[PDB]
PDB file of all heavy atoms in Angstrom:
ATOM      1  N   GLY A   1     -10.748 -11.104  16.304  1.00 40.19           N
ATOM      2  CA  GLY A   1     -11.986 -10.347  16.316  1.00 40.19           C
ATOM      3  C   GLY A   1     -11.764  -8.878  16.614  1.00 40.19           C
ATOM      4  O   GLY A   1     -10.845  -8.519  17.350  1.00 40.19           O
ATOM      5  N   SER A   2     -12.606  -8.025  16.040  1.00 40.97           N
ATOM      6  CA  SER A   2     -12.494  -6.586  16.244  1.00 40.97           C
ATOM      7  C   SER A   2     -13.819  -5.999  16.719  1.00 40.97           C
ATOM      8  O   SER A   2     -14.869  -6.250  16.128  1.00 40.97           O
ATOM      9  CB  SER A   2     -12.054  -5.899  14.949  1.00 40.97           C
ATOM     10  OG  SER A   2     -12.228  -4.495  15.032  1.00 40.97           O
ATOM     11  N   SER A   3     -13.762  -5.216  17.792  1.00 41.26           N
ATOM     12  CA  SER A   3     -14.958  -4.596  18.351  1.00 41.26           C
ATOM     13  C   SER A   3     -15.297  -3.306  17.612  1.00 41.26           C
ATOM     14  O   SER A   3     -14.753  -2.244  17.912  1.00 41.26           O
ATOM     15  CB  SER A   3     -14.759  -4.308  19.840  1.00 41.26           C
ATOM     16  OG  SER A   3     -15.115  -5.429  20.629  1.00 41.26           O
ATOM     17  N   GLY A   4     -16.200  -3.407  16.641  1.00 46.27           N
ATOM     18  CA  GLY A   4     -16.597  -2.242  15.873  1.00 46.27           C
ATOM     19  C   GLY A   4     -16.067  -2.275  14.453  1.00 46.27           C
ATOM     20  O   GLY A   4     -14.907  -1.949  14.209  1.00 46.27           O
ATOM     21  N   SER A   5     -16.920  -2.673  13.515  1.00 46.23           N
ATOM     22  CA  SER A   5     -16.530  -2.754  12.112  1.00 46.23           C
ATOM     23  C   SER A   5     -17.552  -2.053  11.222  1.00 46.23           C
ATOM     24  O   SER A   5     -18.532  -2.658  10.788  1.00 46.23           O
ATOM     25  CB  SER A   5     -16.382  -4.215  11.684  1.00 46.23           C
ATOM     26  OG  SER A   5     -15.374  -4.868  12.436  1.00 46.23           O
ATOM     27  N   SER A   6     -17.316  -0.772  10.956  1.00 47.23           N
ATOM     28  CA  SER A   6     -18.217   0.014  10.121  1.00 47.23           C
ATOM     29  C   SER A   6     -17.540   0.405   8.811  1.00 47.23           C
ATOM     30  O   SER A   6     -16.536   1.116   8.806  1.00 47.23           O
ATOM     31  CB  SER A   6     -18.672   1.269  10.869  1.00 47.23           C
ATOM     32  OG  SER A   6     -19.284   0.935  12.101  1.00 47.23           O
ATOM     33  N   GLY A   7     -18.100  -0.063   7.700  1.00 50.30           N
ATOM     34  CA  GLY A   7     -17.539   0.247   6.398  1.00 50.30           C
ATOM     35  C   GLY A   7     -16.197  -0.418   6.172  1.00 50.30           C
ATOM     36  O   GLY A   7     -15.322   0.142   5.513  1.00 50.30           O
ATOM     37  N   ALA A   8     -16.032  -1.618   6.722  1.00 50.13           N
ATOM     38  CA  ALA A   8     -14.786  -2.359   6.576  1.00 50.13           C
ATOM     39  C   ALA A   8     -14.626  -2.891   5.155  1.00 50.13           C
ATOM     40  O   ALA A   8     -15.157  -3.947   4.814  1.00 50.13           O
ATOM     41  CB  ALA A   8     -14.733  -3.503   7.578  1.00 50.13           C
ATOM     42  N   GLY A   9     -13.891  -2.151   4.331  1.00 54.01           N
ATOM     43  CA  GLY A   9     -13.676  -2.564   2.956  1.00 54.01           C
ATOM     44  C   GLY A   9     -13.425  -4.054   2.830  1.00 54.01           C
ATOM     45  O   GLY A   9     -12.870  -4.676   3.736  1.00 54.01           O
ATOM     46  N   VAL A  10     -13.836  -4.628   1.705  1.00 53.52           N
ATOM     47  CA  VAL A  10     -13.653  -6.054   1.464  1.00 53.52           C
ATOM     48  C   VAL A  10     -12.803  -6.298   0.223  1.00 53.52           C
ATOM     49  O   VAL A  10     -13.325  -6.581  -0.854  1.00 53.52           O
ATOM     50  CB  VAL A  10     -15.005  -6.774   1.296  1.00 53.52           C
ATOM     51  CG1 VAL A  10     -15.886  -6.027   0.305  1.00 53.52           C
ATOM     52  CG2 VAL A  10     -14.791  -8.213   0.852  1.00 53.52           C
ATOM     53  N   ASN A  11     -11.487  -6.185   0.381  1.00 53.69           N
ATOM     54  CA  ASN A  11     -10.564  -6.393  -0.728  1.00 53.69           C
ATOM     55  C   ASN A  11      -9.605  -7.541  -0.428  1.00 53.69           C
ATOM     56  O   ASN A  11      -9.159  -7.732   0.703  1.00 53.69           O
ATOM     57  CB  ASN A  11      -9.772  -5.112  -1.006  1.00 53.69           C
ATOM     58  CG  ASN A  11     -10.632  -3.867  -0.902  1.00 53.69           C
ATOM     59  OD1 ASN A  11     -11.199  -3.407  -1.893  1.00 53.69           O
ATOM     60  ND2 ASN A  11     -10.731  -3.316   0.303  1.00 53.69           N
ATOM     61  N   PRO A  12      -9.279  -8.324  -1.467  1.00 51.83           N
ATOM     62  CA  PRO A  12      -8.369  -9.467  -1.342  1.00 51.83           C
ATOM     63  C   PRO A  12      -6.928  -9.036  -1.088  1.00 51.83           C
ATOM     64  O   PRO A  12      -6.132  -9.792  -0.531  1.00 51.83           O
ATOM     65  CB  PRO A  12      -8.487 -10.166  -2.698  1.00 51.83           C
ATOM     66  CG  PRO A  12      -8.908  -9.092  -3.642  1.00 51.83           C
ATOM     67  CD  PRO A  12      -9.772  -8.156  -2.844  1.00 51.83           C
ATOM     68  N   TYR A  13      -6.599  -7.817  -1.499  1.00 52.63           N
ATOM     69  CA  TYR A  13      -5.254  -7.286  -1.320  1.00 52.63           C
ATOM     70  C   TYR A  13      -5.298  -5.846  -0.816  1.00 52.63           C
ATOM     71  O   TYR A  13      -5.938  -4.984  -1.419  1.00 52.63           O
ATOM     72  CB  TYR A  13      -4.475  -7.354  -2.635  1.00 52.63           C
ATOM     73  CG  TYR A  13      -4.732  -8.616  -3.426  1.00 52.63           C
ATOM     74  CD1 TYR A  13      -5.717  -8.657  -4.405  1.00 52.63           C
ATOM     75  CD2 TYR A  13      -3.991  -9.768  -3.194  1.00 52.63           C
ATOM     76  CE1 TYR A  13      -5.955  -9.810  -5.130  1.00 52.63           C
ATOM     77  CE2 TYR A  13      -4.221 -10.923  -3.914  1.00 52.63           C
ATOM     78  CZ  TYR A  13      -5.205 -10.939  -4.882  1.00 52.63           C
ATOM     79  OH  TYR A  13      -5.439 -12.088  -5.601  1.00 52.63           O
ATOM     80  N   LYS A  14      -4.614  -5.594   0.295  1.00 51.59           N
ATOM     81  CA  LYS A  14      -4.573  -4.260   0.881  1.00 51.59           C
ATOM     82  C   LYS A  14      -3.134  -3.781   1.046  1.00 51.59           C
ATOM     83  O   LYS A  14      -2.323  -4.436   1.703  1.00 51.59           O
ATOM     84  CB  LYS A  14      -5.282  -4.253   2.238  1.00 51.59           C
ATOM     85  CG  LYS A  14      -5.651  -2.863   2.725  1.00 51.59           C
ATOM     86  CD  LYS A  14      -4.421  -2.078   3.152  1.00 51.59           C
ATOM     87  CE  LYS A  14      -4.803  -0.801   3.886  1.00 51.59           C
ATOM     88  NZ  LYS A  14      -5.475  -1.087   5.183  1.00 51.59           N
ATOM     89  N   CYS A  15      -2.823  -2.637   0.446  1.00 48.91           N
ATOM     90  CA  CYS A  15      -1.482  -2.071   0.528  1.00 48.91           C
ATOM     91  C   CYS A  15      -1.056  -1.887   1.981  1.00 48.91           C
ATOM     92  O   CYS A  15      -1.744  -1.230   2.761  1.00 48.91           O
ATOM     93  CB  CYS A  15      -1.427  -0.729  -0.206  1.00 48.91           C
ATOM     94  SG  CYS A  15       0.224   0.042  -0.224  1.00 48.91           S
ATOM     95  N   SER A  16       0.084  -2.472   2.337  1.00 48.28           N
ATOM     96  CA  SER A  16       0.601  -2.375   3.696  1.00 48.28           C
ATOM     97  C   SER A  16       1.161  -0.982   3.967  1.00 48.28           C
ATOM     98  O   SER A  16       1.159  -0.512   5.105  1.00 48.28           O
ATOM     99  CB  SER A  16       1.687  -3.428   3.928  1.00 48.28           C
ATOM    100  OG  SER A  16       1.129  -4.638   4.409  1.00 48.28           O
ATOM    101  N   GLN A  17       1.639  -0.328   2.914  1.00 48.73           N
ATOM    102  CA  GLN A  17       2.203   1.010   3.038  1.00 48.73           C
ATOM    103  C   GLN A  17       1.138   2.012   3.474  1.00 48.73           C
ATOM    104  O   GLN A  17       1.240   2.616   4.542  1.00 48.73           O
ATOM    105  CB  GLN A  17       2.821   1.451   1.709  1.00 48.73           C
ATOM    106  CG  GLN A  17       3.743   0.412   1.093  1.00 48.73           C
ATOM    107  CD  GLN A  17       4.915   0.065   1.990  1.00 48.73           C
ATOM    108  OE1 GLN A  17       4.787  -0.732   2.918  1.00 48.73           O
ATOM    109  NE2 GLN A  17       6.068   0.665   1.715  1.00 48.73           N
ATOM    110  N   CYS A  18       0.117   2.182   2.641  1.00 48.78           N
ATOM    111  CA  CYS A  18      -0.967   3.110   2.940  1.00 48.78           C
ATOM    112  C   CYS A  18      -2.299   2.374   3.049  1.00 48.78           C
ATOM    113  O   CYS A  18      -2.348   1.146   2.984  1.00 48.78           O
ATOM    114  CB  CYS A  18      -1.055   4.189   1.858  1.00 48.78           C
ATOM    115  SG  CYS A  18      -1.133   3.534   0.160  1.00 48.78           S
ATOM    116  N   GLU A  19      -3.377   3.133   3.216  1.00 50.95           N
ATOM    117  CA  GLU A  19      -4.709   2.553   3.335  1.00 50.95           C
ATOM    118  C   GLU A  19      -5.293   2.243   1.959  1.00 50.95           C
ATOM    119  O   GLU A  19      -6.482   2.447   1.717  1.00 50.95           O
ATOM    120  CB  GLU A  19      -5.638   3.503   4.093  1.00 50.95           C
ATOM    121  CG  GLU A  19      -5.991   4.759   3.315  1.00 50.95           C
ATOM    122  CD  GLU A  19      -6.592   5.840   4.192  1.00 50.95           C
ATOM    123  OE1 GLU A  19      -7.536   5.532   4.950  1.00 50.95           O
ATOM    124  OE2 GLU A  19      -6.120   6.994   4.120  1.00 50.95           O
ATOM    125  N   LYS A  20      -4.446   1.750   1.063  1.00 52.63           N
ATOM    126  CA  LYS A  20      -4.876   1.410  -0.290  1.00 52.63           C
ATOM    127  C   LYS A  20      -5.195  -0.077  -0.402  1.00 52.63           C
ATOM    128  O   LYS A  20      -4.718  -0.885   0.394  1.00 52.63           O
ATOM    129  CB  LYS A  20      -3.791   1.788  -1.301  1.00 52.63           C
ATOM    130  CG  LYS A  20      -3.864   3.233  -1.761  1.00 52.63           C
ATOM    131  CD  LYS A  20      -4.738   3.382  -2.995  1.00 52.63           C
ATOM    132  CE  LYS A  20      -6.215   3.273  -2.649  1.00 52.63           C
ATOM    133  NZ  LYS A  20      -7.084   3.658  -3.794  1.00 52.63           N
ATOM    134  N   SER A  21      -6.003  -0.430  -1.396  1.00 52.70           N
ATOM    135  CA  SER A  21      -6.388  -1.821  -1.611  1.00 52.70           C
ATOM    136  C   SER A  21      -6.762  -2.061  -3.070  1.00 52.70           C
ATOM    137  O   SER A  21      -7.065  -1.124  -3.809  1.00 52.70           O
ATOM    138  CB  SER A  21      -7.562  -2.193  -0.704  1.00 52.70           C
ATOM    139  OG  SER A  21      -8.801  -1.937  -1.343  1.00 52.70           O
ATOM    140  N   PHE A  22      -6.737  -3.325  -3.479  1.00 55.10           N
ATOM    141  CA  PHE A  22      -7.072  -3.692  -4.851  1.00 55.10           C
ATOM    142  C   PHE A  22      -7.641  -5.107  -4.913  1.00 55.10           C
ATOM    143  O   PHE A  22      -7.372  -5.934  -4.041  1.00 55.10           O
ATOM    144  CB  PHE A  22      -5.836  -3.586  -5.746  1.00 55.10           C
ATOM    145  CG  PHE A  22      -5.120  -2.271  -5.628  1.00 55.10           C
ATOM    146  CD1 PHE A  22      -4.358  -1.979  -4.508  1.00 55.10           C
ATOM    147  CD2 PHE A  22      -5.210  -1.326  -6.638  1.00 55.10           C
ATOM    148  CE1 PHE A  22      -3.700  -0.770  -4.397  1.00 55.10           C
ATOM    149  CE2 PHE A  22      -4.554  -0.115  -6.532  1.00 55.10           C
ATOM    150  CZ  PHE A  22      -3.797   0.164  -5.411  1.00 55.10           C
ATOM    151  N   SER A  23      -8.426  -5.377  -5.950  1.00 55.14           N
ATOM    152  CA  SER A  23      -9.037  -6.691  -6.125  1.00 55.14           C
ATOM    153  C   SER A  23      -8.089  -7.637  -6.854  1.00 55.14           C
ATOM    154  O   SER A  23      -8.404  -8.807  -7.067  1.00 55.14           O
ATOM    155  CB  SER A  23     -10.350  -6.567  -6.900  1.00 55.14           C
ATOM    156  OG  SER A  23     -10.903  -7.842  -7.172  1.00 55.14           O
ATOM    157  N   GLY A  24      -6.924  -7.121  -7.234  1.00 54.96           N
ATOM    158  CA  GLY A  24      -5.946  -7.933  -7.937  1.00 54.96           C
ATOM    159  C   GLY A  24      -4.580  -7.891  -7.282  1.00 54.96           C
ATOM    160  O   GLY A  24      -4.047  -6.816  -7.008  1.00 54.96           O
ATOM    161  N   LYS A  25      -4.012  -9.065  -7.027  1.00 53.04           N
ATOM    162  CA  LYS A  25      -2.699  -9.159  -6.399  1.00 53.04           C
ATOM    163  C   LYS A  25      -1.699  -8.237  -7.089  1.00 53.04           C
ATOM    164  O   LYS A  25      -0.981  -7.481  -6.432  1.00 53.04           O
ATOM    165  CB  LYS A  25      -2.193 -10.603  -6.444  1.00 53.04           C
ATOM    166  CG  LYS A  25      -0.703 -10.733  -6.180  1.00 53.04           C
ATOM    167  CD  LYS A  25      -0.372 -10.487  -4.718  1.00 53.04           C
ATOM    168  CE  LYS A  25      -0.558 -11.745  -3.884  1.00 53.04           C
ATOM    169  NZ  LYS A  25       0.590 -12.683  -4.033  1.00 53.04           N
ATOM    170  N   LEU A  26      -1.657  -8.303  -8.414  1.00 55.62           N
ATOM    171  CA  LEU A  26      -0.745  -7.472  -9.193  1.00 55.62           C
ATOM    172  C   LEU A  26      -0.946  -5.994  -8.873  1.00 55.62           C
ATOM    173  O   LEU A  26      -0.070  -5.349  -8.297  1.00 55.62           O
ATOM    174  CB  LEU A  26      -0.954  -7.714 -10.690  1.00 55.62           C
ATOM    175  CG  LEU A  26       0.133  -7.170 -11.617  1.00 55.62           C
ATOM    176  CD1 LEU A  26       0.239  -5.659 -11.486  1.00 55.62           C
ATOM    177  CD2 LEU A  26       1.471  -7.829 -11.312  1.00 55.62           C
ATOM    178  N   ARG A  27      -2.106  -5.465  -9.248  1.00 54.88           N
ATOM    179  CA  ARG A  27      -2.423  -4.065  -8.998  1.00 54.88           C
ATOM    180  C   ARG A  27      -1.749  -3.573  -7.720  1.00 54.88           C
ATOM    181  O   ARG A  27      -1.177  -2.483  -7.686  1.00 54.88           O
ATOM    182  CB  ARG A  27      -3.937  -3.871  -8.897  1.00 54.88           C
ATOM    183  CG  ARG A  27      -4.610  -3.623 -10.237  1.00 54.88           C
ATOM    184  CD  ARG A  27      -4.475  -2.171 -10.667  1.00 54.88           C
ATOM    185  NE  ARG A  27      -5.144  -1.912 -11.939  1.00 54.88           N
ATOM    186  CZ  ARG A  27      -4.923  -0.833 -12.680  1.00 54.88           C
ATOM    187  NH1 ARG A  27      -4.055   0.085 -12.277  1.00 54.88           N
ATOM    188  NH2 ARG A  27      -5.570  -0.668 -13.827  1.00 54.88           N
ATOM    189  N   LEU A  28      -1.821  -4.385  -6.671  1.00 50.64           N
ATOM    190  CA  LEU A  28      -1.219  -4.034  -5.389  1.00 50.64           C
ATOM    191  C   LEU A  28       0.290  -3.863  -5.526  1.00 50.64           C
ATOM    192  O   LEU A  28       0.820  -2.766  -5.340  1.00 50.64           O
ATOM    193  CB  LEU A  28      -1.530  -5.108  -4.347  1.00 50.64           C
ATOM    194  CG  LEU A  28      -0.614  -5.142  -3.122  1.00 50.64           C
ATOM    195  CD1 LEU A  28      -1.011  -4.060  -2.129  1.00 50.64           C
ATOM    196  CD2 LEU A  28      -0.652  -6.513  -2.465  1.00 50.64           C
ATOM    197  N   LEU A  29       0.977  -4.952  -5.851  1.00 53.19           N
ATOM    198  CA  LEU A  29       2.426  -4.923  -6.015  1.00 53.19           C
ATOM    199  C   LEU A  29       2.862  -3.678  -6.783  1.00 53.19           C
ATOM    200  O   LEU A  29       3.597  -2.840  -6.262  1.00 53.19           O
ATOM    201  CB  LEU A  29       2.903  -6.180  -6.744  1.00 53.19           C
ATOM    202  CG  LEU A  29       2.842  -7.482  -5.946  1.00 53.19           C
ATOM    203  CD1 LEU A  29       3.018  -7.207  -4.460  1.00 53.19           C
ATOM    204  CD2 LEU A  29       1.527  -8.205  -6.204  1.00 53.19           C
ATOM    205  N   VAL A  30       2.402  -3.565  -8.026  1.00 51.85           N
ATOM    206  CA  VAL A  30       2.742  -2.423  -8.865  1.00 51.85           C
ATOM    207  C   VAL A  30       2.499  -1.109  -8.129  1.00 51.85           C
ATOM    208  O   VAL A  30       3.222  -0.132  -8.328  1.00 51.85           O
ATOM    209  CB  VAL A  30       1.926  -2.424 -10.172  1.00 51.85           C
ATOM    210  CG1 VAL A  30       0.444  -2.599  -9.876  1.00 51.85           C
ATOM    211  CG2 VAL A  30       2.173  -1.144 -10.955  1.00 51.85           C
ATOM    212  N   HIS A  31       1.479  -1.093  -7.278  1.00 55.79           N
ATOM    213  CA  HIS A  31       1.142   0.101  -6.510  1.00 55.79           C
ATOM    214  C   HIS A  31       2.082   0.265  -5.320  1.00 55.79           C
ATOM    215  O   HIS A  31       2.381   1.384  -4.904  1.00 55.79           O
ATOM    216  CB  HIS A  31      -0.306   0.029  -6.025  1.00 55.79           C
ATOM    217  CG  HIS A  31      -0.601   0.952  -4.883  1.00 55.79           C
ATOM    218  ND1 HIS A  31      -0.990   2.263  -5.056  1.00 55.79           N
ATOM    219  CD2 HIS A  31      -0.563   0.746  -3.546  1.00 55.79           C
ATOM    220  CE1 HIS A  31      -1.179   2.824  -3.874  1.00 55.79           C
ATOM    221  NE2 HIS A  31      -0.925   1.924  -2.942  1.00 55.79           N
ATOM    222  N   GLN A  32       2.545  -0.857  -4.778  1.00 53.70           N
ATOM    223  CA  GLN A  32       3.450  -0.837  -3.635  1.00 53.70           C
ATOM    224  C   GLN A  32       4.827  -0.322  -4.041  1.00 53.70           C
ATOM    225  O   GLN A  32       5.623   0.084  -3.194  1.00 53.70           O
ATOM    226  CB  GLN A  32       3.573  -2.236  -3.029  1.00 53.70           C
ATOM    227  CG  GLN A  32       2.255  -2.797  -2.521  1.00 53.70           C
ATOM    228  CD  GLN A  32       2.446  -3.923  -1.524  1.00 53.70           C
ATOM    229  OE1 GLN A  32       2.260  -3.742  -0.321  1.00 53.70           O
ATOM    230  NE2 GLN A  32       2.819  -5.096  -2.022  1.00 53.70           N
ATOM    231  N   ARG A  33       5.101  -0.341  -5.341  1.00 53.22           N
ATOM    232  CA  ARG A  33       6.384   0.122  -5.858  1.00 53.22           C
ATOM    233  C   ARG A  33       6.542   1.625  -5.650  1.00 53.22           C
ATOM    234  O   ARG A  33       7.648   2.116  -5.425  1.00 53.22           O
ATOM    235  CB  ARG A  33       6.508  -0.214  -7.345  1.00 53.22           C
ATOM    236  CG  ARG A  33       5.910   0.842  -8.261  1.00 53.22           C
ATOM    237  CD  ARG A  33       5.659   0.293  -9.656  1.00 53.22           C
ATOM    238  NE  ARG A  33       6.901  -0.079 -10.329  1.00 53.22           N
ATOM    239  CZ  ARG A  33       7.701   0.794 -10.930  1.00 53.22           C
ATOM    240  NH1 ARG A  33       7.391   2.083 -10.942  1.00 53.22           N
ATOM    241  NH2 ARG A  33       8.814   0.379 -11.520  1.00 53.22           N
ATOM    242  N   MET A  34       5.431   2.349  -5.727  1.00 58.46           N
ATOM    243  CA  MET A  34       5.448   3.796  -5.546  1.00 58.46           C
ATOM    244  C   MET A  34       6.076   4.169  -4.207  1.00 58.46           C
ATOM    245  O   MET A  34       6.702   5.221  -4.076  1.00 58.46           O
ATOM    246  CB  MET A  34       4.028   4.358  -5.631  1.00 58.46           C
ATOM    247  CG  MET A  34       3.606   4.732  -7.044  1.00 58.46           C
ATOM    248  SD  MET A  34       1.814   4.774  -7.245  1.00 58.46           S
ATOM    249  CE  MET A  34       1.576   3.459  -8.436  1.00 58.46           C
ATOM    250  N   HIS A  35       5.904   3.301  -3.216  1.00 59.38           N
ATOM    251  CA  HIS A  35       6.455   3.539  -1.886  1.00 59.38           C
ATOM    252  C   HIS A  35       7.912   3.094  -1.813  1.00 59.38           C
ATOM    253  O   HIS A  35       8.319   2.415  -0.869  1.00 59.38           O
ATOM    254  CB  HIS A  35       5.631   2.803  -0.830  1.00 59.38           C
ATOM    255  CG  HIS A  35       4.153   2.996  -0.981  1.00 59.38           C
ATOM    256  ND1 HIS A  35       3.415   3.828  -0.166  1.00 59.38           N
ATOM    257  CD2 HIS A  35       3.275   2.460  -1.862  1.00 59.38           C
ATOM    258  CE1 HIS A  35       2.148   3.794  -0.537  1.00 59.38           C
ATOM    259  NE2 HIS A  35       2.036   2.972  -1.565  1.00 59.38           N
ATOM    260  N   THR A  36       8.694   3.479  -2.816  1.00 58.77           N
ATOM    261  CA  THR A  36      10.105   3.117  -2.867  1.00 58.77           C
ATOM    262  C   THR A  36      10.993   4.350  -2.753  1.00 58.77           C
ATOM    263  O   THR A  36      10.603   5.448  -3.153  1.00 58.77           O
ATOM    264  CB  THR A  36      10.448   2.371  -4.171  1.00 58.77           C
ATOM    265  OG1 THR A  36      11.779   1.848  -4.102  1.00 58.77           O
ATOM    266  CG2 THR A  36      10.323   3.297  -5.372  1.00 58.77           C
ATOM    267  N   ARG A  37      12.191   4.164  -2.206  1.00 54.36           N
ATOM    268  CA  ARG A  37      13.134   5.262  -2.039  1.00 54.36           C
ATOM    269  C   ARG A  37      14.548   4.826  -2.410  1.00 54.36           C
ATOM    270  O   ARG A  37      15.111   3.921  -1.792  1.00 54.36           O
ATOM    271  CB  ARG A  37      13.107   5.770  -0.596  1.00 54.36           C
ATOM    272  CG  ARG A  37      12.035   6.816  -0.339  1.00 54.36           C
ATOM    273  CD  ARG A  37      11.615   6.835   1.123  1.00 54.36           C
ATOM    274  NE  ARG A  37      12.614   7.479   1.972  1.00 54.36           N
ATOM    275  CZ  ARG A  37      12.659   7.336   3.292  1.00 54.36           C
ATOM    276  NH1 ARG A  37      11.766   6.576   3.911  1.00 54.36           N
ATOM    277  NH2 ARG A  37      13.599   7.953   3.996  1.00 54.36           N
ATOM    278  N   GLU A  38      15.117   5.474  -3.421  1.00 55.22           N
ATOM    279  CA  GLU A  38      16.464   5.150  -3.875  1.00 55.22           C
ATOM    280  C   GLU A  38      17.506   5.936  -3.084  1.00 55.22           C
ATOM    281  O   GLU A  38      18.476   5.370  -2.579  1.00 55.22           O
ATOM    282  CB  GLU A  38      16.609   5.449  -5.368  1.00 55.22           C
ATOM    283  CG  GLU A  38      18.019   5.243  -5.896  1.00 55.22           C
ATOM    284  CD  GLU A  38      18.260   5.958  -7.211  1.00 55.22           C
ATOM    285  OE1 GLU A  38      18.401   7.198  -7.195  1.00 55.22           O
ATOM    286  OE2 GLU A  38      18.308   5.275  -8.256  1.00 55.22           O
ATOM    287  N   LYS A  39      17.300   7.244  -2.981  1.00 52.40           N
ATOM    288  CA  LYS A  39      18.220   8.110  -2.252  1.00 52.40           C
ATOM    289  C   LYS A  39      17.540   8.721  -1.031  1.00 52.40           C
ATOM    290  O   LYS A  39      16.329   8.938  -1.009  1.00 52.40           O
ATOM    291  CB  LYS A  39      18.742   9.219  -3.168  1.00 52.40           C
ATOM    292  CG  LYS A  39      17.722  10.310  -3.443  1.00 52.40           C
ATOM    293  CD  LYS A  39      16.857   9.975  -4.647  1.00 52.40           C
ATOM    294  CE  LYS A  39      15.442  10.504  -4.482  1.00 52.40           C
ATOM    295  NZ  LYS A  39      15.331  11.931  -4.892  1.00 52.40           N
ATOM    296  N   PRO A  40      18.337   9.006   0.010  1.00 53.20           N
ATOM    297  CA  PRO A  40      17.832   9.598   1.253  1.00 53.20           C
ATOM    298  C   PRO A  40      17.392  11.046   1.068  1.00 53.20           C
ATOM    299  O   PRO A  40      18.125  11.976   1.402  1.00 53.20           O
ATOM    300  CB  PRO A  40      19.037   9.522   2.195  1.00 53.20           C
ATOM    301  CG  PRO A  40      20.223   9.505   1.294  1.00 53.20           C
ATOM    302  CD  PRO A  40      19.790   8.773   0.054  1.00 53.20           C
ATOM    303  N   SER A  41      16.188  11.230   0.534  1.00 52.25           N
ATOM    304  CA  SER A  41      15.651  12.565   0.301  1.00 52.25           C
ATOM    305  C   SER A  41      15.810  13.438   1.542  1.00 52.25           C
ATOM    306  O   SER A  41      16.669  14.318   1.589  1.00 52.25           O
ATOM    307  CB  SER A  41      14.174  12.482  -0.090  1.00 52.25           C
ATOM    308  OG  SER A  41      14.028  12.216  -1.475  1.00 52.25           O
ATOM    309  N   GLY A  42      14.977  13.187   2.547  1.00 50.98           N
ATOM    310  CA  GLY A  42      15.041  13.958   3.776  1.00 50.98           C
ATOM    311  C   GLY A  42      15.585  13.152   4.937  1.00 50.98           C
ATOM    312  O   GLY A  42      15.714  11.929   4.868  1.00 50.98           O
ATOM    313  N   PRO A  43      15.917  13.844   6.038  1.00 48.77           N
ATOM    314  CA  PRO A  43      16.456  13.204   7.242  1.00 48.77           C
ATOM    315  C   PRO A  43      15.413  12.360   7.967  1.00 48.77           C
ATOM    316  O   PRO A  43      14.226  12.416   7.650  1.00 48.77           O
ATOM    317  CB  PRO A  43      16.884  14.389   8.112  1.00 48.77           C
ATOM    318  CG  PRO A  43      16.023  15.519   7.662  1.00 48.77           C
ATOM    319  CD  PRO A  43      15.789  15.301   6.193  1.00 48.77           C
ATOM    320  N   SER A  44      15.866  11.578   8.943  1.00 47.89           N
ATOM    321  CA  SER A  44      14.972  10.720   9.711  1.00 47.89           C
ATOM    322  C   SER A  44      14.120  11.544  10.671  1.00 47.89           C
ATOM    323  O   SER A  44      14.626  12.422  11.370  1.00 47.89           O
ATOM    324  CB  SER A  44      15.777   9.677  10.490  1.00 47.89           C
ATOM    325  OG  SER A  44      16.181   8.612   9.649  1.00 47.89           O
ATOM    326  N   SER A  45      12.824  11.252  10.700  1.00 48.13           N
ATOM    327  CA  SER A  45      11.899  11.968  11.572  1.00 48.13           C
ATOM    328  C   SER A  45      10.779  11.048  12.047  1.00 48.13           C
ATOM    329  O   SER A  45      10.571   9.967  11.498  1.00 48.13           O
ATOM    330  CB  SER A  45      11.308  13.175  10.842  1.00 48.13           C
ATOM    331  OG  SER A  45      10.338  12.772   9.891  1.00 48.13           O
ATOM    332  N   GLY A  46      10.057  11.486  13.075  1.00 49.60           N
ATOM    333  CA  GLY A  46       8.966  10.691  13.608  1.00 49.60           C
ATOM    334  C   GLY A  46       8.974  10.639  15.123  1.00 49.60           C
ATOM    335  O   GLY A  46       9.444  11.585  15.753  1.00 49.60           O
TER     336      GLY A  46
HETATM  337 ZN1   ZN B   1       0.182   2.165  -1.232  1.00 49.09          ZN
END
């Protein structure tokens, strides 16, 4: 349970990477691919 739910989107699939979501399992996956990294662009931060 969550205390306070205003405008809580109702999607069957929600991108774990960002606050993205889709009504189709596929759409998500294909979208989750964008969050991929082949080479170490920048150094570690955070
Ligand atoms: Zn995403």
Side-chain angles (χ1 to χ4, degrees):
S2 167
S3 273
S5 299
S6 304
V10 49
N11 320 268
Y13 321 93
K14 197 288 191 66
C15 182
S16 270
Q17 311 300 81
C18 52
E19 70 195 310
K20 274 270 75 170
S21 90
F22 309 74
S23 175
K25 164 73 84 79
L26 194 299
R27 272 279 181 196
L28 160 79
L29 288 331
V30 50
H31 161 87
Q32 299 200 105
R33 87 198 296 280
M34 271 158 244
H35 313 256
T36 189
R37 274 154 75 197
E38 175 199 74
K39 75 272 146 84
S41 277
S44 281
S45 75

